[PDB]
Design an enzyme around this catalytic site. Structure first.
Site, PDB file in Angstrom:
ATOM      1  N   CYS B  14       1.085  -0.978  -0.231  1.00 58.65           N
ATOM      2  CA  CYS B  14       0.242   0.112   0.337  1.00 58.65           C
ATOM      3  C   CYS B  14       1.253   1.383  -0.247  1.00 58.65           C
ATOM      4  O   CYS B  14       1.471   1.647   0.954  1.00 58.65           O
ATOM      5  CB  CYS B  14      -0.790   0.654   1.312  1.00 58.65           C
ATOM      6  SG  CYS B  14      -1.836   1.648   1.035  1.00 58.65           S
ATOM      7  N   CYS B  17       0.096   3.975   2.735  1.00 58.75           N
ATOM      8  CA  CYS B  17       0.337   3.115   3.994  1.00 58.75           C
ATOM      9  C   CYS B  17       1.495   4.036   4.817  1.00 58.75           C
ATOM     10  O   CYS B  17       2.032   4.000   5.323  1.00 58.75           O
ATOM     11  CB  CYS B  17       0.295   2.247   4.792  1.00 58.75           C
ATOM     12  SG  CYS B  17      -1.349   1.330   3.742  1.00 58.75           S
TER      13      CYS B  17
END
Ligand SMILES: [Mg+2]
Ligand SMILES: [Mg+2]
Lengths: 92, 92
Positions: B14, B17
């Site tokens: 991700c 993230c």
């Protein structure tokens, strides 16, 4: 701004929900152009409550572009709710 | 004040993230007395992610008294995260 929908997951046997619901309706009325409030009785729609992880009431879920962006659990004073919503109301 | 624990549900694949995680660690460091931050890799612990309704990453879940009180979905700038946490950090 993208439309926002606040979903109020409540139950008829919930005391705190009684406090929160009129505060939420006042909020919707006061920010009618940007915010829609919908009440969902978790005993009437348990599948929906489960879909959005509601495990206690009241649980407020804010939707933007059809998906939750924030979820707050429990009742809170008007001032606290206003301030949680403000950044989203002032955002894109 | 009751201890607060912010759980950062993320995945190694991700992008956003990557942005958020160091901001969260800076926050924990900056409010060490009141706030603990724990990272949970959703691919390492899918059952845990499911237990707390995590359907996308990053999802930040704030715990008070061992239960979630707030959940925010998606990455947000440092300023926005600070302001979301402030009322809880200043509350009981
Ligand atoms: Mg208002
Ligand atoms: Mg700070």
């Amino acid at each position: 701004g993208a439309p926002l929908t606040l979903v109020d997951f409540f139950a008829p046997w919930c005391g705190p929900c009684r406090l929160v619901s009129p505060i939420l309706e006042e909020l919707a009325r006061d920010h009618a152009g940007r915010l829609k409030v919908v009440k969902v009785n978790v005993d009437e729609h348990p599948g929906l409550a489960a879909r959005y992880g509601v495990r206690s009431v009241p649980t407020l879920v804010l939707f933007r572009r059809g998906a939750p962006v924030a979820t707050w659990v429990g009742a809170s004073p008007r001032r606290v709710l206003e301030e949680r919503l403000r950044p989203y109301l002032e955002g894109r």
